[PDB]
């Protein structure tokens, strides 16, 4: 179980993230710490350029390595895109190249930003005696001013902490399957319900702290890949590293194991088959720290709460494990409400979407087919 890297409170996201690395440190972290303005006055691009090879041996523990992988990711980024015009770089230039690369390496991680560093690691609280509450946190890193990556990575990071108060049911399910415990797991199931439903009121947060147009002309710019990207068509150079491209896929909330891993508890099959949808988020775990993708393997691994509750002729059962697959049917159609205004209406307001809502519409509509009764 800790095997797993799952924190009683904040799920999947790294419990207190660092926020300084050692001193040693400093020429990659004051570049990180200034993007909006480095990018703005077109200086990020030769300061990157003219960076001293920084060897990755006196990152000692995991939350420094994790600081380090945002730090880079966002550095990369930053000088992949640029001002975010189209103007892109198609080498990362080997003095950083090469420390990302061995620092991804080491945590079993791609060398490109990911959910895992922008979100679940790139959060901090105001007030330490104070909840996580919006309010009280911030994010450590953005890319410019006014990209909302505020209120973007946070009520992400807020979604995902909500439904891992769902996390920790997770063993009762199956201990009580294995004892024969049928009121242990009705009432397991309806816990996972009721927080999958409140992850939603949290949801509605993005209204608030996100702006349309500064998500989809700056900020969605910033976190795309270079994976099927036509402004990358062969992928990335990373200099010194590999001798060819690579392709890495933008950061994705595809790479959280919070719904990926109640999809796989309710037997929901999301990734089964061999359409497009089922393989990007097959994919998508490739950008998992190792820890939480054991999670999800040693998931599939276990008994079917599905096939147990479709044996019993229990309503009970039936109606609890329903109201679960319900709870990520009303998630996920929300969700397609936030893709229509955040990307499909800016996008017709400038002087592609249906590819995107089709893969959305199929992950909801693999979801309600798991209903057991209708409803
Ligand atoms: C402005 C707000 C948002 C926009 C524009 C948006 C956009 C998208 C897009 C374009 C995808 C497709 C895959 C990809 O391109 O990477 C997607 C998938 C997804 N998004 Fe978001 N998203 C938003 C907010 C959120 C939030 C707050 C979460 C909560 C953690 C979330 C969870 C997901 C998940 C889980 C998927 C994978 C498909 C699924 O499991 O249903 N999204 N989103
Ligand atoms: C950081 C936070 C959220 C996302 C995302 C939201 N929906 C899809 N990906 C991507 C990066």
């Not at 999947?12 to 001193?23: K, M, S, T, V, Y």
């Not at 040693?24 to 003219?50: C, T």
């Not at 990755?56 to 966002?74: F, N, P």
Request: net charge neutral; charged share 20%.
């Amino acid at each position: 179980s800790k095997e797993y890297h799952i924190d009683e409170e904040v799920g999947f996201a790294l419990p207190n993230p660092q926020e300084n690395l050692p001193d040693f440190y400093n020429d990659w972290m004051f570049i990180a710490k200034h993007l909006p303005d480095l990018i703005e006055s077109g200086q990020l691009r030769e300061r990157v350029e003219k960076l001293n090879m920084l060897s990755i041996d006196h990152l000692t523990d995991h939350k420094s390595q994790r600081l380090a992988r945002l730090v880079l990711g966002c550095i990369t980024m930053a000088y992949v895109w640029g001002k975010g015009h189209g103007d892109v770089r198609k080498v990362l230039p080997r003095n950083i190249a090469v420390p990302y690369c061995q620092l991804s390496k080491k945590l079993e991680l791609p060398p490109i930003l990911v959910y895992a560093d922008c979100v679940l690691a790139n959060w901090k609280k105001k007030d330490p005696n104070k909840p996580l509450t919006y309010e009280n946190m911030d994010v450590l890193f953005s890319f410019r001013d006014g990209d909302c990556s505020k209120g973007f990575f946070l009520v992400s990071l807020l979604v995902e902490i909500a439904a891992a108060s769902a996390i920790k049911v997770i063993p009762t399910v199956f201990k009580a399957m294995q004892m024969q415990e049928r009121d242990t797991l009705l009432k397991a199931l309806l816990e996972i319900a009721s927080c999958l439903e409140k992850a939603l009121q949290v949801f509605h947060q993005i209204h608030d702290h996100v702006n349309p147009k500064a998500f989809f002309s700056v900020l969605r710019i910033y976190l795309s890949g270079w994976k099927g990207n036509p402004q990358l068509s062969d992928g990335l150079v990373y200099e010194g590293f590999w001798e060819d491209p690579k392709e890495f896929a933008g950061a994705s909330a595809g790479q959280s194991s919070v719904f990926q891993c109640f999809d796989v508890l309710l037997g929901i099959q999301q990734t089964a088959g061999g359409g497009h949808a089922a393989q990007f988020l097959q994919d998508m775990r490739r950008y998992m720290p190792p820890a939480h993708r054991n999670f999800l393997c040693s998931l599939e691994s276990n008994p079917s709460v599905r096939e147990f509750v479709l044996s019993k002729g229990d309503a009970g059962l039936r109606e609890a494990y329903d109201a679960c697959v319900k709870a990520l049917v009303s998630l996920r159609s929300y969700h397609l409400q936030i893709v229509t205004k955040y990307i499909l209406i800016p996008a017709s307001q400038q002087p592609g979407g249906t590819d995107l809502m089709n893969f959305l519409k199929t992950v909801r509509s693999t979801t309600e087919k798991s209903l057991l009764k209708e409803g």
